[PDB]
Design a binder for this molecule. Structure first.
Ligand SMILES: Nc1nc2c(ncn2[C@@H]2O[C@H](COP(=O)(O)OP(=O)(O)NP(=O)(O)O)[C@@H](O)[C@H]2O)c(=O)[nH]1
Ligand SMILES: Nc1nc2c(ncn2[C@@H]2O[C@H](COP(=O)(O)OP(=O)(O)NP(=O)(O)O)[C@@H](O)[C@H]2O)c(=O)[nH]1
Ligand SMILES: Nc1nc2c(ncn2[C@@H]2O[C@H](COP(=O)(O)OP(=O)(O)NP(=O)(O)O)[C@@H](O)[C@H]2O)c(=O)[nH]1
Ligand SMILES: Nc1nc2c(ncn2[C@@H]2O[C@H](COP(=O)(O)OP(=O)(O)O)[C@@H](O)[C@H]2O)c(=O)[nH]1
Ligand SMILES: Nc1nc2c(ncn2[C@@H]2O[C@H](COP(=O)(O)OP(=O)(O)O)[C@@H](O)[C@H]2O)c(=O)[nH]1
Ligand SMILES: [Mg+2]
Ligand SMILES: [Mg+2]
Ligand SMILES: [Mg+2]
Lengths: 290, 336, 290, 284, 290, 285
């Protein structure tokens, strides 16, 4: 596996991709913050094969935090057995033990929509240990539910962690500033401007004028969205995922297809987004169709 | 002791907060106006529905609700008396935003000088919200709500709640409250004016682009590159258009209300803003001084140091629409 | 099952239904938003048999969400068998296992009053999985309560999810915009001014003048309601169900019948919609009767 | 139909409305005999005074879906799934389809009605009653076992109109429920005939209605704060005179200070003078 | 364990470490209160070996507190067997018992992220014993779960307790009452304006002018944050550890290396800080890049 | 146990009358006035015997529970066993000797929730509703006939710390029953001085020290709404540390100034250090 294979279809620039591996390899914990529809989940599976250098799923682990994840789930917890309770090794604890089987080959743990859960509750002991510096046997620590016999749990050096926090829900935003220093935050753009986005459409039977018209209108809208910060901040700006999918059968992109998108998905989104005057809704809706 | 009619300030506050009939109410004073907005504002929300935020609850109950916490259960041995510690999401209206409304209403009633009907109607509302718990309000409470998850409508009434508490003073009695004489102090009234325009111009002047611009001194000093001692300079507003740029400095002074000497000390700030600002576009550079006057509005133009500068006034107390017309008339002259 | 079986009694136009079935085959997740009383519950069971094309209720599961509903009940969670607790595969998990057995046949899950429960908390892991392009074993994910990383849960491709969410309550709205992207939102109107609704009335020995007068009356009223979008959006407008049922006896729809229902149902509603204006209540109430 | 103080027309409206729609809400201020109407009314609809069919409950803010329908609660050995009353009650009518079984919910306004009912908030509708519309419950282990409202079941809701909560408004539930107002009924002869058949003075009764109605009109004067929903009920007069104490102004004077004055205080809060006026006005 | 190895690398003045050692011998219950990234965790591991005078792991123990941490794990509690419940001596209990054997040798217990869990919930009864005056067998107490009153636990005088607390969260405005009385707070400065931090930078092939230019900015920026009290106090200010990291390769400091750090760590942190004033973000970010 | 207590004689005598009547006192006040010490010695005085067994002391915290206090079901090797608490067991001893006076000391009572801990017994512990007549079956009692009654001999002392800013309002349940008593720091008293005079302290150092703390304590009490009177520093630091026979002098004093008093000033004065240094200077300068 290599960069050329992954980056064939991605609409994100190479620039960020190098920025990721630059920040990742030094720091080992990163966050990609962007609105939905920019391929956050999409890139993450591809990146894992790069660092390992091979397309292997075993060295990768993927999860989503659902505002009910707990330290009992991630690390160490007690589960019913048939008649009586037992202690169960969590998933991350299960993952690290495999990861330290070989330091040579890198192991990745991927958490989608990480911002939701109360991360201090989930990680507990791990919040310190995740950092690049504080890894290995030097910083071994005994866990809460560890046996009285001293047995210690340390983050292996080979492990790299990636989190995928959407920036739309403001309430569900990381306010644990102690934790926000452990991670490095990578802003991801909607991906309209790139030709690599455009070429995908032209390859799929698209007019350059219709294509260039499309990006022109979205960029105007996102600026109007980006202008506000009171309610709708920079992060709220619309992703490109809506346009990406559904054309595999041979349906060529045209104003009919775009009009279906505008009426069906985005226009409901806009009225929820604004919810002050319809005229602003009527304005931008007609603009896209025009 | 001449001042603006109180109703007009509310319009400027609206643009200051960035988002109705006021003719009905007979009380000219502010708190009568402000309370009626809130007292109606609460009722407007209830029609649509108030915010309900799922608060997770971890408590000791005799059965399974949501997700059971195995650890706290076994550690406390709650199984034996038929109980579990389980996490579940009771849905309440007891959020910080709604608690603030109820606490604000308590303050509103306690104000000694207020329309009786306003006080009567609000006391109903306090009773109509039994679940919500009273709180002792501080700005720090409002600070936590800067996240602004809430709807656009909630932010308006909360801004009112911010205004009332800060502008509330205890009066004759220990329990009751008395309203601040907001109009008399120039600084807060002036700070309203500067913010009033900045958000206002974004609304109406779609033609031009409106931004506050920080400026940097042209100076260099051998002592320090920082130049921290030098005054920090940030424009009140800049309203840039392709044909012409324009900087405005606006302030509220009492001396100008008298129709004699003129208080234009702010002008001293202005030239240095023109000087330190250098436009790449090089279309033109213009400046504006705008002040509030009560009786009448007068516009003048000047050619001072290669700059085209205007000193102008607005006749607040006339009427809001003509004032809105007047402002659009004002910027139209100079923005050219 | 057949298409024409449904359309006989259905007041909604076919065009929306064609829009519905086109999106649903593509997106596989949808939300129907409108006021109460327009047949969201009515269509949903009908539409499922259309999409499958066969009248199989075994393949369809219908549920109504509410506040006291969680991932433990829905997907997976630990619950008491008796003396000993067990991991109880929830309703949605069981539904997916059934659909896995028969990939060819479409299996449909219908959620009434979806907007109430905290969907982020309820779906959780599913929130990512449900996407039309991420279904399959490639995106299989280990759950919270899974014993190991190897045990993983993936949505089948055949699954279609249908959401029913009333727009009368703005407090309860699906503001989670990332979740909003997964669902393709299909507005529904009361559809008073349609032939199929009137033909049902005329079939019940009704005056054409009274019927056409009736449709004109509400159309003006709904537009008045839609005007004050700050106060009341289109979502609040009156549904058609008040008029639909109650004629099963064979009672002809005279003006007296209308006068009874308006006094009992719509009259207090207008009082609440217009709390401030008593005159406005009197205006529209009297307008229908006269 | 003899000792009831509410018009025959309203109950005649109700019985047709109930039989057709199968769900109703009887909304009025306290002291108007909401409970007695419903208890009487169910016996009318059944036609026999059978109490086993009829069950009454009084909601309260802490009531939950765990209590009503299903829920996990402990036996002696441990925890189990415990079928709530309504599931148990619907099974009772499901055992006997022919007869009409009734369920009464008092103090309905207090609780989050959506929360308790949950699944049945759809099912309760008269058309969607039967196995076809059955659904698996939240706590049901398997989808196959489902719950469906039977056709015979009828629900009556009793609501206090004097404590409005501007917390949650549901207009969808309002579609399920056919709302019927109840007036206090001082003007009605049937209330007066009871008292005139209790050795009341004719003038004493007639002047009383003038007194109470003027108070009721004042409460309905300011529609926003108060309404017909707040105004005074009659039921306080029914009880306390069956011992044998015939009507007199002294008897009324007990009730005014005993009962009505806190209500007046509650309604006309922070306005003692209005209390003194309206309290004293009645006594004369 | 020589001071020269320990204290040379450290950025903190030799003045403050001396005072830290003074009060620690005196009171034995000490708290280091500072923002993240000032080496609070870094110093604490070294200080233990300073006091003991030797590199021994057994005499020093480290833990991180979190919400799940409890008395039953920390001190004493019952852990389920296959069915039965067996009492278990906890860490702090087990650690002191080792310290009981060797009263002369100094023993250290290190507690990171102490504010996250309430001390009463974990320590509980021991807050009486933990205090410096009420130590030794004279103050011995029988424990909550002790089988008989005869068994007793007393904090030997030798143990010293260090607690690492970060002043980065809004909740910590209400500092726990237990901490203030029983622990002695020490404030840790960010410590940019130090020779050793600079001397560290210069040693790694760094221009002095570029280094000194940076120090003016960080001292300038933290002043802006520290001036505020409502939203961001003095305790919220930036630490000195973003800049320490990333130099193991030997890559010289420059604007290129700096630009990665500002954009990927400090810029989005400022977005969270100065949410209300976006332009203030631009004001500082451009300043730092220069 | 009454030889040298820095507190004035009036208050310690007033309490004894108050305690014999009300039987439930709360001692407020700043930390470092020997709240336990004054309370501990008073317990021996009320009995008149310097015997520890009759006296018992426990420190309350928010997680302190009814299970620890009264009755709980801790597991033995095989199965759960009811375990008597402190107060429950404590009364069994006092019931033996009704003639004698038994005393229960409760530190930091406001911190914990009284109701969850005491539960049923909160009614009985009031002085009136005492004796066999008011006996009630306990919550965990398997048999109704076995009951718990508060004997008259028991006297309850509570220590509450005024200093904490986090404290806003006293618990209602606490206030109805207990008689709050305020102990001044008593930094300017003869008995405190006479102890210091017995140690090698000259009158000027005494007068210097007593004068300076009065001025500083006056500042804290002066800003009453901003800071409670109970914020003012106590005297216990000056008691301890001189047992070795060390002479108290300005050289010795400056250690305590910087070590104990300075962080307390830092905690109390969290706004302006410029104000703090002004007051630290006067203590020594
Ligand atoms: N072909 C192609 N598809 C892309 C690209 N970027 C995003 N997409 C598509 O957009 C859809 C969603 O991408 P995804 O990673 O899930 O975005 P997300 O941020 O994880 N979603 P969310 O924030 O809602 O959780 C998928 O169809 C994904 O493949 C791209 O560069 N090329
Ligand atoms: N006969 C007939 N009835 C219809 C038709 N459309 C809707 N209805 C009726 O309107 C009533 C409600 O249907 P429903 O889907 O539950 O409406 P809803 O919008 O989901 N209501 P809610 O949101 O409150 O649950 C039923 O009486 C239903 O049969 C129709 O086309 N024909
Ligand atoms: N070489 C060197 N590294 C330092 C110095 N100070 C801090 N660091 C480095 O900064 C990084 C983190 O330090 P750390 O103690 O964990 O900060 P913290 O206070 O514990 N962080 P937090 O508050 O978030 O828990 C480590 O690489 C640490 O060695 C120092 O003076 N010299
Ligand atoms: N005879 C007769 N008794 C009534 C009538 N209305 C109420 N009562 C009696 O008044 C008493 C209290 O009624 P209650 O249900 O508690 O009042 P409500 O619930 O607020 O309506 C009962 O004895 C009722 O039967 C009525 O109309 N006729
Ligand atoms: N001799 C004597 N000792 C005192 C006096 N006051 C306090 N002490 C001692 O001061 C020390 C601390 O007492 P205490 O207030 O209980 O500590 P706290 O828990 O921090 O409040 C103990 O040794 C007390 O006995 C006093 O007036 N005379
Ligand atoms: Mg995604
Ligand atoms: Mg429906
Ligand atoms: Mg740390």
């Amino acid at each position: 596996y290599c960069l050329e294979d992954a980056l064939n279809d991605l609409f994100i620039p190479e620039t960020t991709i190098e920025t990721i591996l630059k920040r990742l390899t030094i720091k080992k914990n990163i966050i990609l913050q962007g609105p939905p529809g920019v391929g956050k989940t999409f890139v993450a599976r591809r990146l894992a094969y790069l660092l390992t250098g091979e397309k292997a799923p075993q060295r990768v682990n993927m999860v989503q935090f659902h505002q009910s994840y707990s330290y009992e789930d991630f690390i160490q917890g007690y589960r019913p057995n048939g008649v009586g309770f037992r202690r169960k090794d969590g998933i991350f604890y299960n993952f690290c033990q495999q990861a330290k089987e070989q330091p040579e080959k890198k192991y990745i743990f991927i958490i989608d929509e990480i911002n939701r859960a109360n991360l201090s509750k989930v990680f507990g002991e791990v919040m310190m240990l995740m950092e690049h510096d504080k890894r290995g046997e030097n910083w071994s620590v005994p866990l809460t539910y560890s046996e009285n016999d001293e047995e210690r749990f340390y983050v292996p050096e080979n492990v790299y962690i990636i989190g995928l926090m959407n920036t739309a829900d403001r309430s569900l935003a990381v306010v644990d500033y102690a934790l926000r220093r452990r991670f490095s935050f990578i802003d991801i753009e909607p991906g309209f401007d790139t030709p690599q986005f455009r070429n995908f459409l032209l390859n799929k039977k698209a007019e350059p004028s219709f294509v260039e018209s499309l990006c022109q209108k979205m960029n105007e809208l996102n600026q109007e969205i980006s202008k506000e910060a009171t309610i709708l901040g920079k992060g709220f700006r619309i992703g490109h995922s809506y346009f990406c999918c559904g054309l595999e059968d041979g349906t060529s992109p045209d104003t009919q297809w775009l009009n279906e998108i505008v009426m069906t998905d985005i226009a409901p989104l806009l009225e929820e987004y604004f919810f002050d005057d319809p005229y602003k809704q009527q304005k931008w809706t007609n603009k896209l169709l025009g | 002791q001449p001042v603006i009619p109180v109703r007009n300030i509310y319009y400027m506050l609206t643009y200051a907060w960035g988002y109705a009939n006021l003719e009905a109410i007979p009380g000219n004073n502010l708190l009568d106006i402000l309370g009626y907005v809130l007292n109606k504002g609460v009722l407007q929300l209830s029609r649509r529905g108030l915010e309900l935020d799922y608060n997770p609850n971890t408590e000791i109950i005799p059965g399974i609700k949501g997700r059971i916490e195995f650890a706290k259960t076994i550690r406390g041995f709650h199984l034996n008396h038929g109980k579990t510690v389980s996490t579940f999401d009771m849905l309440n209206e007891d959020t910080l935003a709604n608690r603030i409304i109820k606490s604000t209403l308590a303050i509103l009633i306690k104000h000694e000088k207020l329309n009786s009907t306003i006080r009567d109607e609000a006391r109903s509302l306090y009773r109509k919200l039994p679940g919500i718990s009273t709180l002792h309000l501080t700005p720090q409470h409002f600070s936590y709500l800067n996240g602004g998850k809430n709807t656009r409508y909630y932010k308006f009434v909360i801004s009112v709640c911010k205004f009332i508490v800060n502008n509330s003073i205890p009066g004759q009695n220990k329990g009751h409250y008395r309203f601040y004489d907001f109009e008399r102090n120039e600084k807060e009234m002036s700070l309203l004016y500067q913010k009033f325009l900045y958000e206002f111009c974004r609304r109406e002047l779609t033609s031009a682009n409106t931004t506050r611009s920080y400026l940097k001194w042209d100076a260099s000093s051998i002592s320090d590159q920082s130049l921290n001692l030098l005054p920090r300079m940030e424009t009140d507003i800049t309203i840039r258009s392709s044909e012409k740029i324009l900087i405005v400095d606006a302030k509220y002074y009492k001396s100008i209300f008298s129709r004699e000497k003129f208080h234009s000390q702010n002008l001293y700030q202005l030239m240095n803003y023109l000087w330190s600002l250098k436009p790449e576009n090089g279309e033109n550079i213009g400046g504006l001084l705008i002040y509030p006057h009560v009786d009448t509005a007068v516009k003048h133009r000047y050619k001072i140091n290669g700059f085209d500068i205007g000193l102008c006034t607005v006749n607040l107390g006339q009427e809001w629409p003509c004032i809105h017309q007047e402002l659009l008339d004002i910027f139209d002259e100079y923005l050219k």
